[PDB]
Structure 1
Amino acid sequence: DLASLAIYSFWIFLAGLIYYLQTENMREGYPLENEDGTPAANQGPFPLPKPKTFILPHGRGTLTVPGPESEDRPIALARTAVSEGFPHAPTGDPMKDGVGPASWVARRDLPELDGHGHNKIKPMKAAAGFHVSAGKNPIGLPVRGCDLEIAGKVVDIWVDIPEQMARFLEVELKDGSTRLLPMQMVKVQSNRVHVNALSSDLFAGIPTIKSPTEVTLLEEDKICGYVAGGLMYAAPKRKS
């Protein structure tokens, strides 16, 4: 009867869809590897999808996935055990070396562009005429570290123009240079900005940006990686 046919039909379709969907979600990270980076023997029952090619706007060419995968950076780790499945210990300083929670990815060393091919993220001082419309203005506040030491002062907000939101505070350090801090990793308070992730002594080691009026996808990943790594790694120097 027509209803039994409909439901048997559906289950067949649902199976093909789950298969279609799984292969679609294998366009990055695959094929699987051993800890040494050679391709693993057992890959699962799902094959790699046929490559698709995004055309990136603004003359940035194409991406084709799945494509060849390399970290394009050295990984300062060493095995802690003689078999698969154990942690790999940082061989250096994991914050400086950019491993574990301090991990960054070798993204294009260009900045994200808006629809019109202008930079997405500008310091607010070069954004006509972006102002703080609500909440506390963080500009001029001191920046405190998790060791409850002042590390610097906020001298600008870096804003997303097309989404009109604050993305970084630019912080001036004891030495006169600046760094960016993710907006998502600071507590703006009445009288200071508090940074839980980093102690005062680690602000110096935040990666710096090569141009003062733009930040690249690479630089973004290094900065954000380094700050998030602080939660694990600057834990000795955190109070409450």
Structure 2
Amino acid sequence: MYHGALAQHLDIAQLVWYAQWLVIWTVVLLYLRREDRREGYPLVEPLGLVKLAPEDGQVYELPYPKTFVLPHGGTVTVPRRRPETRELKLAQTDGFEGAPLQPTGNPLVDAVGPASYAERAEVVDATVDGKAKIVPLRVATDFSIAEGDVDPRGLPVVAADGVEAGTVTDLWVDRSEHYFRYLELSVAGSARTALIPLGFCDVKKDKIVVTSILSEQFANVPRLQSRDQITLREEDKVSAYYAGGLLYATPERAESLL
């Protein structure tokens, strides 16, 4: 006789094999893939017009909503109705359903393609105890640059065309993570300030290289509502601006590298 044997050529391990596959596909299909749909769903079509009743598959693929109670008041429920209001200045290259769109105006200012920003809250991201998290050093006076690293305040910013475009006046720091996230710079010849994400910054000892945009393009970097704080949407607006430059700053950057 045999441990694990069952009637007529079955055995325990053979059953567990089937059980295990079932468990996996259950978690993957009925749980994980629905969690994946808590953003961006329901999908959009060349106008889905059935306004009276919903199509069955769009109800089945969604999970039951969940609510996050936010740390400084508020709740967010996902998934939810979140359509893109803004007029996108794009035009259809063709009639085909998955053909790309072309920008109609100036894609950096018009904030399309790689220059698009999410419609995040117009609120300032906060520290654990309520303060503005992302502030420049004029405000965050107990934060310093660390012993050994370039202090960029004073250094020039050189844009992609080798042209000095302004002077770094300040660094904005993340007070929750102790991490510098933007440099503030004066834009030469236009008497305004502008924020740059450090990820677009090549920090040298004598200058700050910025290859994402041209010197002239520092004029139209999105402006903040306030001098000394920034909202999550403004952070998106600012970061997206330079990313747009990677593809749009010159005509030649959109076309094939070879």
Is the Cα contact below 8 Å between 1:158 and 1:167 reproduced in 2? yes
Q: If you compute each CA radius of gyration, which structure gives the higher value, 1 or 2?
A: 2
Equivalent of residue 153 in structure 1, options 160, 167, 170: 167
Deviations 1:71-112 (A, max 9, x none): 131111111111201001112111111000100111111111
Distance, in Å, in 1 between the alignment partners of 2:58 and 2:122 is 35
Deviation at residue 202 of structure 1 after TM alignment: 0.3
- Secondary structure class of the residue paired with 1:4: helix
Normalised TM-score (structure 2): 0.86
Long gaps (5+) in structure 2: 1-10, 254-258
- Secondary structure class of the residue paired with 1:89: strand
1:176 aligns with 2:187: no
Equivalent of residue 42 in structure 2, options 10, 31, 38: 31
Deviation at residue 37 of structure 1 after TM alignment: 7.2
1:140 aligns with 2:140: no
Is the Cα contact below 8 Å between 2:88 and 2:112 reproduced in 1? yes
Identical-residue share of aligned pairs (%): 41
Distance, in Å, in 1 between the alignment partners of 2:150 and 2:57 is 52
Aligned letter for 1:124? L
Distance, in Å, in 2 between the alignment partners of 1:79 and 1:37 is 19
- Secondary structure class of the residue paired with 2:114: helix
> Which residue does 2:217 correspond to in 1?
202
- Secondary structure class of the residue paired with 1:166: strand
Query: Which range is displaced more, 206-215 or 64-73?
Result: 64-73
Equivalent of residue 128 in structure 1, options 131, 141, 144: 141
Deviation at residue 117 of structure 1 after TM alignment: 1.2
Normalised TM-score (structure 1): 0.93
- Aligned residue pairs total 237
Is the Cα contact below 8 Å between 1:72 and 1:106 reproduced in 2? no
1:220 aligns with 2:230: no
> Which residue does 1:80 correspond to in 2?
93
Is the Cα contact below 8 Å between 2:134 and 2:230 reproduced in 1? yes
1:164 aligns with 2:175: no
CA-based RMSD of the aligned residues comes to 2.1
- Secondary structure class of the residue paired with 1:231: helix
Long gaps (5+) in structure 1: none
